[PDB]
Amino acid sequence: MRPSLSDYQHVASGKVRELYRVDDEHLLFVATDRISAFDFVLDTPIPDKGRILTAMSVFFFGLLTVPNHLAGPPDDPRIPEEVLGRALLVRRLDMLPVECVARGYLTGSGLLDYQRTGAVCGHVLPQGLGEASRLDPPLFTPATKADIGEHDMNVDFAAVVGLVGAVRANQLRDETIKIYTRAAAHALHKGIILADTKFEFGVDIEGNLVLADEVFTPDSSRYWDAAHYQPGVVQDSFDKQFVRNWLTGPESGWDRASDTPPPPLPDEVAVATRERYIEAYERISGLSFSDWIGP
Ligand SMILES: CCn1cc(-c2ncnc(N)c2C#N)cn1
């Protein structure tokens, strides 16, 4: 018999993910069906989003050869029925206070930093780059969490050294670029560009570096349709563009310029978005989401 979620201690709330203590050495990492757009957690959940993103993370953990925090199978008996398929039993780590970001393409705050300074996170780049320009080699563009509402702050390699040590910073940089490169090539082979990605790592009892959190989800990574990749313009979000377009379209009644919370989504937009998540998962993994476990 699976335990109730109420049997575990809630330790951390993200906007979209939850974390619970299972015992002294294990956590329960829970994805919800909540979706964020324009830095708002929207009223309307995307059905099965938590399950699909959990399935995606599990796929990529298996694709990569590096140590990760998974501590049991997706149907581990310690996982409550209520969160089955969207929760993982993981090893408790000492988390390193660095957002480990790799960028294979120049967009978002990376592009903005470049347009302001000619550099991103200490990397002085060629002149003449622009929106969605390919970056070769991919860049390690680390960041640190800021206050509750604020975006992460981009920092350079020296900042990472000061946070975790010189040898460890080297290790973070190398592993971040290595696993990003591997996953990005895999996805592109299936017609999806992983434009960038954000990792969190922790350290286990033996001092080993361990990949944690979620990996290569469309929340942790910019997913693009490769078939429509066009450097020089903003690429559509593979998963979130229907949501973005509706929210900023004539039917929402919402003004994004106002920092007022957005209205709920049409059911059909939520269902369409769910479909996009399933398509991305199935294309990348070569698996069927209908086989993924659930309540
Ligand atoms: C919800 C984001 N978050 C994850 C942790 C964490 N902490 C300790 N050990 C771990 N494996 C993890 C993970 N994943 C702390 N915040």
Swiss-Prot record:
GO MF annotation terms: ATP binding; phosphoribosylaminoimidazolesuccinocarboxamide synthase activity
CDD domains in alphabetical order: SAICAR_synt_Sc
Source organism, top-level taxon: Bacteria
GO BP terms, alphabetized: 'de novo' IMP biosynthetic process
Gene Ontology cellular-component annotations: cytoplasm
One matching Pfam family: SAICAR_synt
PROSITE patterns assigned to the protein according to its UniProt record, in alphabetical order: SAICAR_SYNTHETASE_1 (PS01057), SAICAR_SYNTHETASE_2 (PS01058)
Enzyme class: ligase
Catalytic activity annotation: 5-amino-1-(5-phospho-D-ribosyl)imidazole-4-carboxylate + L-aspartate + ATP = (2S)-2-[5-amino-1-(5-phospho-beta-D-ribosyl)imidazole-4-carboxamido]succinate + ADP + phosphate + 2 H(+)
InterPro entries from the UniProt entry: SAICAR_synt/ADE2_N (IPR028923), SAICAR_synth (IPR001636), SAICAR_synthetase_CS (IPR018236)
Keywords noted in UniProt: ATP-binding, Ligase, Nucleotide-binding, Purine biosynthesis
Associated pathway: Purine metabolism; IMP biosynthesis via de novo pathway; 5-amino-1-(5-phospho-D-ribosyl)imidazole-4-carboxamide from 5-amino-1-(5-phospho-D-ribosyl)imidazole-4-carboxylate: step 1/2
EC nos: 6.3.2.6
Similarity remark: Belongs to the SAICAR synthetase family.
Protein name per Swiss-Prot or TrEMBL: Phosphoribosylaminoimidazole-succinocarboxamide synthase
Organism encoding this protein: Mycobacteroides abscessus (strain ATCC 19977 / DSM 44196 / CCUG 20993 / CIP 104536 / JCM 13569 / NCTC 13031 / TMC 1543 / L948)
